[PDB]
Scaffold this active site. Structure first.
Site, PDB file in Angstrom:
ATOM      1  N   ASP A 109     -48.966  50.951  55.831  1.00 51.89           N
ATOM      2  CA  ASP A 109     -48.408  50.599  54.553  1.00 51.89           C
ATOM      3  C   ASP A 109     -49.596  50.473  53.625  1.00 51.89           C
ATOM      4  OD1 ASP A 109     -47.512  49.256  52.241  1.00 51.89           O
ATOM      5  OD2 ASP A 109     -45.984  48.148  53.301  1.00 51.89           O
ATOM      6  N   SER A 145     -50.860  65.889  40.965  1.00 52.75           N
ATOM      7  CA  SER A 145     -49.666  66.332  40.253  1.00 52.75           C
ATOM      8  C   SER A 145     -50.111  67.016  38.959  1.00 52.75           C
ATOM      9  CB  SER A 145     -48.742  65.141  39.955  1.00 52.75           C
ATOM     10  OG  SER A 145     -47.596  65.534  39.190  1.00 52.75           O
ATOM     11  N   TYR A 170     -45.381  57.022  35.886  1.00 57.59           N
ATOM     12  CA  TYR A 170     -45.722  58.064  36.882  1.00 57.59           C
ATOM     13  C   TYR A 170     -47.004  58.843  36.497  1.00 57.59           C
ATOM     14  CZ  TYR A 170     -45.502  62.131  39.924  1.00 57.59           C
ATOM     15  OH  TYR A 170     -45.817  63.112  40.805  1.00 57.59           O
TER      16      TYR A 170
END
Ligand SMILES: NC(=O)c1ccc[n+]([C@@H]2O[C@H](COP(=O)([O-])OP(=O)(O)OC[C@H]3O[C@@H](n4cnc5c(N)ncnc54)[C@H](OP(=O)(O)O)[C@@H]3O)[C@@H](O)[C@H]2O)c1
Ligand SMILES: NC(=O)c1ccc[n+]([C@@H]2O[C@H](COP(=O)([O-])OP(=O)(O)OC[C@H]3O[C@@H](n4cnc5c(N)ncnc54)[C@H](OP(=O)(O)O)[C@@H]3O)[C@@H](O)[C@H]2O)c1
Lengths: 279, 277
Positions: free
Chosen positions: B65, B142, B155
């Site tokens: 995690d 991205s 984002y």
């Protein structure tokens, strides 16, 4: 009546000098709320306001901690005029070191203050500006948000984050009449350790660091602008009738931002900035 | 000497697809540690790996995690070879909406998982690569980290953050022998009461314009996680890898238009009409 300005991070530097520059403007068109994390740091502010002879009621202080949305809210409620014409998101933390020496909490805090805090400010104050069809938002951007630099890994992360945050909103805000700009600052006239560092980092990083530090203090001394100079750029952006998304305080770095964006694979910048920092 | 690879966010998508691909590789050159937020979710991963008869011992799963440094360190010490040749920071969250409509916690989650999460991985794995003088780090980027898009404010802030963090480390890391690369993805295949109250009617309009326009771009542009996964493989096996790799050249014009105007006014004008009719 006057253009209502609210500014975060006014205890020193750009925030302090901008607030009094505006409140002391000979036009007397500005009401300034200079906001501060802790009201106990307001001395220098009130000294400078008094030196520049700011008229009564041109300048007020609020406590505003950008990690705390209720502090954000309480400051907004304290804007008697009931609107903000100019929001300046200027509060910001520094962080400087080899990635592996920085404490985890300190990494979190830089993001929380620089990025999440700027989001909270925009969340609290944008609706009124949208509903109204006007408002200028100015964000204290950085050259470290356009190009990466070693040992500024997390600081650079947060200033790149502002680029992304602001560029996205600015595309939404066109048919609203709200003009978001970034004021891209280079170095300015206003963080490391020793045994803490070396324990966590490695023997060669340890030395590459001060070859960065002792190199940086050179670029400090050839382009570290006055905050008056910088403040003045924030003014040009306010008085701009169609302001752009970015403004630059100094030109001394538009060579690299040319070179960087020539190579979309990006390894030209990596090579060139490595040589230019070290040897 | 098999190549030891550790990948975050392997329950599905890019991470799953990269994990099986490396573990099935005909050479058996790779030993893969595919990690997950929660292990209980590993069913699909092993089904995919079983589909390609990934030999025994070529794939191990772990819980990792990225919000928790102890989870990261515990995962690290389960790496029985005592090193990682290839580290893939792929764990990520999305968040889509008008800025003023997004919860405060949701905003801090995205930054904590996407940015701080990646910082934790790098803090835990880089030093080993540095003293050894070798290693590869691949980060899932991205196009949203290269250009801002409306309603993707947070984002994009997080993917932009990745760019700065990685470009800053890359300059330090040339002389250490550690190569960092960003794999820059475009889109990839896998309520209006509540909106309206938190936002003016003006913006409620734009959001649904944007939502209809996004649908179209996804139908046209989206890639299989497998096509993406192949670009990671190029970067892996590039003998001197570059800072970025693009999984599509589709958005490189829009990107150059943005690189033309540092003042950014052209990018915004173009993307505004382009997005909103
Ligand atoms: O460089 P430069 O001219 O931009 O300024 P600078 O001289 O680096 O000072 C940064 C400013 O940001 C403020 N700041 C830091 N954390 C904050 C928080 N959580 N909330 C509100 N303000 C905060 C600082 O107040 P403090 O220095 O009092 O934190 C200071 O006023
Ligand atoms: O691939 P894609 O483009 O299709 O995107 P995606 O599959 O929607 O998400 C990529 C990966 O990010 C993982 N992730 C999210 N939060 C995480 C955390 N705190 N620690 C570790 N991994 C985390 C996701 O796990 P979950 O979806 O299993 O949370 C998923 O496996």
């Amino acid at each position: 009546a006057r253009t209502v300005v609210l500014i975060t991070g006014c205890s020193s530097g750009i925030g302090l000098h901008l607030a009094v520059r505006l409140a002391s403007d000979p036009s007397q068109s500005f009401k300034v709320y200079a906001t501060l994390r802790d009201l106990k740091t307001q001395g220098r502010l009130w000294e400078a306001a008094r030196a520049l002879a700011c008229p009564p009621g041109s300048l007020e202080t609020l406590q505003l901690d950008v990690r705390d949305s209720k502090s954000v809210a309480a400051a907004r409620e304290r804007v008697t005029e009931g609107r903000v014409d100019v929001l300046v998101c200027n509060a910001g933390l520094g962080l400087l070191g080899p990635l592996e020496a920085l404490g985890e909490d300190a990494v979190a805090s830089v993001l929380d203050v620089n990025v999440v805090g700027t989001v909270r400010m925009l969340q609290a104050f944008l609706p009124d500006m949208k509903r109204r069809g006007s408002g200028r938002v100015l964000v204290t951007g950085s050259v470290g948000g356009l190009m990466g630099l070693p040992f500024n890994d997390v600081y650079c992360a947060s200033k790149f984050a502002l680029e992304g945050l602001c560029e996205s909103l600015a595309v939404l805000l066109l048919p609203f009449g709200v003009h978001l700009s970034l004021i891209e600052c280079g170095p300015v006239h206003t963080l490391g350790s020793p045994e803490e560092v070396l324990d966590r980092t490695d023997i060669h990083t340890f030395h590459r660091f001060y070859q960065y530090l002792a190199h940086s203090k050179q670029v400090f001394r050839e382009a570290a602008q006055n905050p008056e100079e910088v403040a003045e750029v924030f003014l040009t952006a306010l008085r701009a009738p169609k302001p752009t998304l970015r403004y630059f305080t100094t030109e001394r770095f538009l060579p690299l931002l040319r070179m960087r964006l020539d190579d979309p694979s990006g390894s030209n910048y990596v090579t060139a900035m490595h040589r230019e920092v070290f040897g």
